[PDB]
Design a protein around this ligand. Structure first.
Ligand SMILES: Cc1cc2nc3c(=O)[nH]c(=O)nc-3n(C[C@H](O)[C@H](O)[C@H](O)COP(=O)(O)O)c2cc1C
Ligand SMILES: Cc1cc2nc3c(=O)[nH]c(=O)nc-3n(C[C@H](O)[C@H](O)[C@H](O)COP(=O)(O)O)c2cc1C
Lengths: 348, 348
């Protein structure tokens, strides 16, 4: 069973091919600090049996936050909390990783269970187009603003390494800053950073290159992309192949294949495995390693997409909110006798 | 669905009829203190959705421990750890309870994953019969020894209340001290505490009475019993009915119906729900409230035994070692929309 066979990335060996997908908990302090909520939530899933845990979207500067309760990494005073989080993930059995983030024109909304309405922050983006009705008009970035945010990504990554995280993922998806540079639905610039495909990829590729130079080759660097935006005349799978080629040449280890989130009024053909063909096409047509994600909920499903060569890694989100010990029971269901804490041996 | 209907016991209201059965983790310090292991293990299950958590067997004196890594409650310096444990169970959503324990002739063994062999402690019991080959011969208790242990139960209970626990269970089952007084297989005394049924019940009934006097009527008192020992000429279901009648008259709130553990060489007809008839017979023939336990693993199973009038409460052990969020998903499967932490709302 490939699902419970070790995976080599960079200098590491993950004990299996399951990972916890990044999932915002909206439970940090007002200064972006780790709380008791995170120190229970994450190590529960590490005991649950994933080889790799990708911690939720973490903001590289305060205006990069999705909400006033997002995690942050813009300050040296975030280091004690983040270091404690990574340490507890590791001791529960998993490799700790983290996603680095800037919300862009979608920054500064309320929590999902408090209505989720825009709070009127002075948000930034490529072009002055609001995300939707009620949303603030983003301020277009000049070249000095781009450089500032780029430096924040480079410093954010060094600080993640100092805290003990061994996988770094760049969030270039779901309509947030770098995703909004890629799609023509949000980017209508007429300078060097808009118009052509090459122009639209420019700022996202500069961020990737600069972070790669500060992360040693032993530790993997991931990128998450929306493979398509589902909108007519928007970002396509073919664009994703061109972008993946350029990431491969810069030394990116793996492309994490998601979709959607750029615009709001689009039809999405939701079904088990609906994003797997995007992971399959990059891996087979470019030769870059991939992560598959999107309504993956059973052991046999995840095993089969690996056997088909569609991805190297399987990412799980929602199933782990309602069933954190899924990977231990999945192993048993595929005829592998799982490694469990000795305290729970009579439970299996 | 009775399974997710509130239950009134004493002065409390449990939000549902599921409880976490007591399960030794062998992860305390050498002084019986709470550790990081317990502070992750227990609140995980409280978020998982049980109305009541019964913390593992906790030793009322050091010679009462099953292992050198059992929890203890013999000292005021156990209070800070126990208080922190109860507080974290409560804040994750469950009523915190605790089982009080004395291992008897089965005291002082190694952990299950370190071989489980006797360490040669100076153990006590009713009669000088070893549990099995290799085991130390217990020293028979005199009346002063009985009184000492009885006081330890009374003080143990006051200390549990000071820590914030709201349900107290007495462990009079599984071949440990008070269970071994009940069965003729371990008790062959010829004084006032052996021979007849009434004699064999005497020390166990004295413990129950004394603890009941220090626990206020608003807080429930439980007793766990082996309803049978499965051995020819041993403790029977009929004996259990007589014993339950006497517990009812003393003000005991509920009888927790288990079986076995007194002797080792007995045939046990293991199957889903094999201990439910014992809970059913006490509840219907005596009118004392009951807890059912033993290979209960599905929502429909637990609902049906409640509909039949076989018990008031359902206790879950092994299913919660491998699936701690079972009760949230069980609710959904019975058509009740569960109460979940807002962070996990999109998972359901
Ligand atoms: C509550 C919640 C929070 C999420 N937060 C993030 C995030 O911070 N960053 C990210 O890239 N994706 C995020 N996602 C998307 C998931 O990582 C995942 O890609 C998506 O839910 C599909 O996988 P699933 O069907 O296995 O959940 C989130 C999803 C949910 C439901
Ligand atoms: C590892 C382990 C530890 C246990 N510890 C205790 C205990 O400390 N006290 C107790 O009364 N029962 C204990 N039990 C018995 C369980 O509480 C339960 O009655 C039994 O496992 C049957 O329920 P289940 O089939 O739902 O697990 C333990 C069982 C296991 C597997």
């Amino acid at each position: 069973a490939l699902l419970f066979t070790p995976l080599e990335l960079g200098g590491l060996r993950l004990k299996n091919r399951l990972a916890m997908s990044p999932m915002d908990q909206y439970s940090a302090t007002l200064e972006g600090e780790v709380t008791d909520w995170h120190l229970l939530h994450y190590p529960t899933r590490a005991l649950g049996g994933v080889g790799l845990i990708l911690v939720e979207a973490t903001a590289v500067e305060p205006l990069g936050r999705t909400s006033p309760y997002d995690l942050g990494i813009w300050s040296e005073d975030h280091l004690p909390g983040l270091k404690e989080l990574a340490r507890r993930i590791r001791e529960a059995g998993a490799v700790p990783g983290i996603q680095l983030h800037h919300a862009g024109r979608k920054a500064g909304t309320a929590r999902p269970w408090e209505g989720g309405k825009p709070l009127g922050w002075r948000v930034v983006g490529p072009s002055p187009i609001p995300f939707d009705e009620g949303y603030p008009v983003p301020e277009p970035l000049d070249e000095a603003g781009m450089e500032r945010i780029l430096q924040a990504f480079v410093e954010g990554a060094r600080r993640a390494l100092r805290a003990g995280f061994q996988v770094i993922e760049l969030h270039m998806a779901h309509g947030y800053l770098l995703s909004s540079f890629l799609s023509p639905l949000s980017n209508q610039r007429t300078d060097a950073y808009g118009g052509s495909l090459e122009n639209r990829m420019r700022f996202p590729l500069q961020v990737a290159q600069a972070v790669r130079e500060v992360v040693p080759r032993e530790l993997p660097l991931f990128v998450r992309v929306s493979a398509t935006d589902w909108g007519e005349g928007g970002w396509s799978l073919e664009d994703t192949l061109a972008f993946a080629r350029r990431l491969k040449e810069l030394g990116v280890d793996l492309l994490d294949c998601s979709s959607g989130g750029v615009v709001l009024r689009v039809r999405i053909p939701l079904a088990p495995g609906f994003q797997v063909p995007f992971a399959d096409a990059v891996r087979k047509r470019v030769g870059l390693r991939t992560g598959a994600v999107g309504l993956i909920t059973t052991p046999e499903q995840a095993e089969t997409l690996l056997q088909a060569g569609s991805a190297d890694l399987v990412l799980l989100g929602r199933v782990l909110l309602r069933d954190p010990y899924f990977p231990l029971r999945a192993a048993k269901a595929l005829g592998v006798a799982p490694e469990v804490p000795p305290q729970y041996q009579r439970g299996f």
